[PDB]
Ligand binder design. Structure first.
Ligand SMILES: CCCC[C@@]1(C2CCCC2)Cc2cc(OCCCc3nnn[nH]3)c(Cl)c(Cl)c2C1=O
Ligand SMILES: CCCC[C@@]1(C2CCCC2)Cc2cc(OCCCc3nnn[nH]3)c(Cl)c(Cl)c2C1=O
Lengths: 410, 410
């Protein structure tokens, strides 16, 4: 039989994309404009959370299922196809909260996902040699199968209840639906490889969103160049320059955030559900960076507009990195089982890692405060941080050594 | 010191996105239409080939420098930031071969890639422990360093020469440019994990192009639905049904191709550069499937139109699969060095592996011949191939035995 690892990777390489799809409507967007933008942000966040919950269920499922073969791979592909429709169905439901057809479609999506997962469980247990070794030696194989089936089919059951009740009173259906996401929390390790794969996929997609847009839209047209720019191609490129600047900033920020994430996870011994939650929040907010940078690159009709956009960029960068730092703190709370020895309290790289993770929250906080105190140079300082933070990463060892030496003579 | 697996995987995801970026205009496409689409397809194929050459150079580089470091990771991020621009500048250069600015831009991009990689080499050799263990042993560290810089910089030099020549005679510049890819072939293992990661990224993005499109475009507007269908939302869904069917077909075909590729590579021990070439061709043609399914879902003004649309779809599937089959046969040609014993000639799964691969190209060829012989049912037969091939993959392990059973009674 097969080594399941690669297959799971592909699933993540799929789910990441499905998780991030609803970002694109946000970027392409221009009481009317602001409300619409906020609606798109809310829809994107909810879709990302839903896809993350589905991914968590998948990760647990294939944690139980150790090895795989042909039929398991095909059923996993079918499950992936069913999960791919969650963004679209959810968007339909939200855009049409009145008619029951939308909630019915979303509930059918969830039901299909859970049914495929239950079929996978049944096939795996019918061939115990596929299951993980601890499950194989589990004397509760029948009871364990019963419990796993209950867990997997709870979601579909609640969704079926919501669908039936939608024909009469939809609020009950909505409550039953949120129950699906609530109960698994209300009534554990996430295999590090799965978390790493999903996070890397999300980071890559978010980093290359803006170049995707640029290649799809900005490539000059010879007719346009000859007519509007009178054949001066360099003028045509300088016209779209701002999108290049925004992409440069987005790639810098997202790449350095991924660098901090990589440094953190290199020393993590054993992930946890709490770290999973915090990582999910961190990624959901990392998704916002391209929007912030697009807004920054755009014109500012009034000083207040530019100040507000700088505020938003700083706030997004903060929210993105603060949860990443909180992951590290939560790990420190269970240091013995969570983190490598080299990053324990007083460890050789403990302070270095702390600075590496806290570099972005602190810089963003200073930039945000600049708006409340130094509105004169506010935007400028923002630009400065965009160049300051990368440099500190190159010099991080020397910078931390300087800080420690300064504290020595304090 | 770090383990480079995750950093390489993230870089591979980035490069997959960059390579498959240029397909988006092809799908978004509607003597004028035909020529425009031909130009788009040529642009896409050349962009994919050039980005794969860049990825191949990257793979060799990070084969030589095994371990990594924070500063080296940042250098790699900088390298990716420039490799990401190859699509845009190549498209611009193809759009503006007349003016020297576009060729200069492409040239500076390639020289930037080369100089970043040269810095990586210099740093790796300034810290010998970062090199791969066998290289660390090499008594030729000096001469091998010189050779590595020679291979890395062969491009940059030729591109610089072409950029200089662009001001006087552009044909010489283009000849020098193509010499960059000519020389390495005219005057080796590709690390398997890199090949699997790149192929998984390609397949994952290609399978979900269509749903990505659907999420942004087909969500009905309530202001539109209320009028166009008097609140009949199901009418709106049925209006776009064909797009959903196109997505279903695209995902099924792409996922089953990924299943064949995964089963192939799980038995592959060392991917030879020939295998890399064949995989590049296979992925490049796998890119086309979304276009094929979009064309198939589109209306047919005349029977000739639908016939030709079936022909092109079948040709694309046939190419995408026959290249994998050719990779498999080339592997058989060196099974002793490349393939696991289990799939060697006369192996237990040898017949199973061969059938698994050859299932799709043969089906496409049969559906193609149906047009030349059975035009009456041709289109239906194509749909049959969309239904049969999935089941054939489910029942393959049985079906092959059935076939063998025939060869026992015959
Ligand atoms: C030599 C250090 C360069 C480091 C990075 C690399 C990103 C990933 C690791 C390094 C990050 C970065 C930020 C930049 O700031 C963009 C602000 C936009 C603007 N416009 N006017 N003023 N500021 C610019 Cl410009 C550049 Cl080139 C670069 C890079 O290459
Ligand atoms: C029951 C197993 C089927 C396997 C797959 C899954 C894809 C990924 C792994 C399995 C593939 C597939 C192809 C289809 O073909 C599309 C019909 C196009 C049409 N029909 N009428 N007119 N045009 C349909 Cl329908 C479906 Cl359901 C499915 C699946 O679920």
């Amino acid at each position: 039989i097969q080594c399941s690892q690669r297959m799971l990777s592909f699933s993540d390489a799929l789910l990441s994309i499905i998780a991030t799809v609803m970002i694109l409507p946000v970027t392409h967007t221009e009481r009317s404009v602001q409300r619409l933008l906020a609606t798109r942000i809310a829809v994107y966040l909810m879709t990302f959370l839903i896809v993350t919950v589905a991914w968590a269920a998948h990760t647990r499922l294939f944690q139980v299922v150790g090895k795989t073969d042909d039929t398991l791979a095909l059923l996993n592909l079918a499950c992936m196809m069913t999960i791919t429709f969650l963004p679209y169905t959810f968007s339909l439901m939200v855009t049409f909260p009145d008619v029951p057809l939308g909630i019915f479609l979303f509930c059918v999506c969830v039901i299909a996902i859970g049914v495929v997962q239950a079929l996978i469980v049944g096939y795996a247990f019918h061939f115990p040699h596929l299951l993980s070794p601890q499950i194989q030696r589990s004397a509760h194989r029948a009871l364990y199968r019963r419990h796993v089936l209950g867990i997997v089919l709870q979601g579909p059951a609640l969704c079926f209840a919501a669908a039936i009740f939608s024909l009469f009173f939809v609020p009950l259906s909505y409550l039953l639906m949120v129950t699906v996401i609530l109960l698994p929390y209300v009534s554990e390790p996430l295999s590090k490889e799965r978390v790493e794969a999903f996070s890397d996929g999300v980071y890559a997609i978010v980093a290359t969103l803006l170049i995707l847009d640029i290649c799809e839209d900005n490539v000059p047209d010879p007719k346009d160049v000859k007519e509007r720019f009178s054949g001066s191609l360099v003028a045509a490129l300088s016209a779209t320059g701002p999108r290049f600047l925004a992409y440069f900033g987005s790639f810098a920020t997202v790449g350095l955030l991924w660098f901090a994430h990589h440094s953190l996870f290199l020393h993590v011994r054993k992930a946890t559900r709490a770290m999973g939650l915090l990582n999910t929040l961190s990624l959901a907010f990392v998704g916002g960076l391209p929007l912030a940078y697009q807004q920054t690159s755009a014109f500012a009709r009034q000083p207040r507009d530019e100040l507000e956009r700088v505020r938003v960029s700083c706030t997004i960068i903060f929210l993105a990195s603060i949860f990443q730092l909180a992951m590290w703190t939560t790990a420190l709370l269970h240091q013995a089982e969570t983190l490598q020895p080299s990053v324990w309290f007083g460890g050789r790289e403990h302070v270095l890692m702390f600075a590496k993770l806290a570099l972005y929250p602190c810089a963003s906080l200073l930039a945000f405060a600049s708006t409340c105190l130094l509105s004169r140079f506010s935007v400028g300082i923002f630009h400065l941080m965009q160049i300051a933070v990368p440099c500190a990463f190159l010099l991080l060892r020397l910078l931390v050594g300087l800080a420690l030496a300064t504290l020595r003579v304090l």
